[PDB]
């Protein structure tokens, strides 16, 4: 029997947070992910990790579809994989953030899906959907992004005449432009340029680049 998400791994009998194999496509091929079985009861599947700044997240539309990085350190699970999970089960979002002043923050969203109930994710541009927002330390930036297709310097889907993905040095479900750019350039602290680093607008504004970043997912 195969665990397709990481809440299954909780049921399999594994509760130590680490790298694990889950089968979102099928029993043919797994894909490794890191799971945070500790935070708020555990069962978190992580589709986004950043901390060293070593891995560059200014990648193309193809890398963000298939995913890139190491499940150990910084990585991105991949938009296709994420859509496979959100397509077959209802999921909850949690993002956990940290600055360079030894402070932590987070934000939770009850519903989370990538292009939900879409017969083809490509055609729909892998839209992001987030519903009811429960506040943690940080504010609510993602509710601004709900309903927006994922954009890169390869594929501009944003509502802006310019290429907001190119101006922001990252990839996100951009609108006129982001309130959250968790794939921006790791400028490591404050920066005089506008809205191009790993920024959570509602927590540390547009001129502050976080130190650590990770976006977690759990079953409904």
């Amino acid at each position, epitope marked *: 029997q195969q665990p397709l998400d990481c809440d299954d791994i909780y049921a399999q009998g594994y*509760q130590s947070d680490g790298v694990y194999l889950i089968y979102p496509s099928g029993p043919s091929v797994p894909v490794p992910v890191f799971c945070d079985m500790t935070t708020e009861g555990g069962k978190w599947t992580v589709f986004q990790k950043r901390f060293n700044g070593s891995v560059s997240f200014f990648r193309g539309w193809n890398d963000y579809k298939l995913g890139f990085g190491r499940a150990d350190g910084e990585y991105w699970l991949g938009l296709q994989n994420m859509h496979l999970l959100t397509l077959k089960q209802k999921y909850e979002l949690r993002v956990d953030l940290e600055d360079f002043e030894n402070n932590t923050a987070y934000a939770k969203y009850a519903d989370f899906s990538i292009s939900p109930n879409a017969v083809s994710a490509e055609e729909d541009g892998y839209t992001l959907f987030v519903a009811g927002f429960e506040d943690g330390g940080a504010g609510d930036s993602l509710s601004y992004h709900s309903g927006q297709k994922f954009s890169t310097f390869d594929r501009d889907q944003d509502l802006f005449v310019q290429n907001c993905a190119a101006l922001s040095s990252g990839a996100f479900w951009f609108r006129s432009c982001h309130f959250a750019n968790l794939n921006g350039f790791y400028l490591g602290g404050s920066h005089l340029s506008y809205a191009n680093g790993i920024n959570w607008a509602q927590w540390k504004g547009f001129y502050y680049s976080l130190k650590r970043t990770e976006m977690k997912i759990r079953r409904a």
Partner: antibody, heavy 122, light 108 residues
Framework: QMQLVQSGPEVKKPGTSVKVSCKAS????????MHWVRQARGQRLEWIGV????????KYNEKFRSRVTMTTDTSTSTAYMELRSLRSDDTAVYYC???????????????WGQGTTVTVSS | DIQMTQSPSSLSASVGDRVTITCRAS??????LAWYQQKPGKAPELLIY???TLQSGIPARFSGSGSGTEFTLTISSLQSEDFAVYYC?????????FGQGTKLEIKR
């Protein structure tokens, strides 16, 4: 129906070991985590630890490590709890409880046995 | 680590009354807490979980609220079955602490 049948009482001398059984019926035993809790009379309940039958992974309370060891027999749908070196204050009622799953924090016990009153005295 | 202290140690009230029990946390415990109802010489039964959500089959008059350090359990109108000992559990962290226990007795 969903039931957990624990072992009857045992009287043990100090320093000896006791082995408590807890057999499951009415639900697939391998699916749910199993918790062990003790209730000293008129005092605060103490959570012993947890074990999953399918994997056998365990997680204990810090003060009971080295003393308690948990095992499970998958064939008979039984969960075991054994406290190795006993102490006069360990006299209490020992329960086995099932953690339901519920799309989130879970970690709360919806189905309980019915007690194994353990008495330790010289 | 993460002591739980219940109040009042004993409460006496009559049928039909509104009753409230409180569980206190030593450190911030977040949204997650659960309550139990233990009859004499019986196994505990679970009532509320994650602070405010009740288990299936529990009467609607049971309801929980609170967050952070203070939590409360209230019953709209008591009934003869409601008189028992109520325990509050830690639930958020994995040391796992329990509440001191609150006796709810009938008043004559």
């Amino acid at each position: 129906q969903m039931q957990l049948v624990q072992s009857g009482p045992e009287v043990k001398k100090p320093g000896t070991s006791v082995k408590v059984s807890c057999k499951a019926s009415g639900f697939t035993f391998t699916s749910y985590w199993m918790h062990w809790v003790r209730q000293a009379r008129g005092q605060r309940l103490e959570w012993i630890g947890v074990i999953h039958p399918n994997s056998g992974n365990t997680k204990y309370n810090e003060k009971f490590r080295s003393r308690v060891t948990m095992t499970t027999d998958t064939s008979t749908s039984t969960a075991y709890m054994e406290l190795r070196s006993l102490r006069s204050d360990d006299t209490a009622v020992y329960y086995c409880a099932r953690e339901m799953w519920n799309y989130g924090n879970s970690w709360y016990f919806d189905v309980w046995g019915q007690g194994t009153t353990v008495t330790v005295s010289s | 680590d993460i002591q739980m202290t219940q109040s009042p140690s004993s409460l006496s009230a009559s049928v039909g009354d509104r009753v409230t029990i409180t569980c206190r946390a030593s450190k911030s415990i977040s949204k997650y807490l659960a309550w139990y109802q233990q009859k004499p010489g019986k196994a505990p039964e679970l009532l509320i979980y994650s602070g405010s959500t009740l288990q299936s089959g529990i009467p609607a008059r049971f309801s929980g609220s609170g967050s952070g350090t203070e939590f409360t359990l209230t019953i709209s109108s008591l009934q003869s079955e409601d008189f028992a000992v109520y325990y509050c559990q830690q639930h958020n962290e994995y040391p796992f602490t329990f509440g001191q226990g609150t006796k709810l007795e009938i008043k004559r």
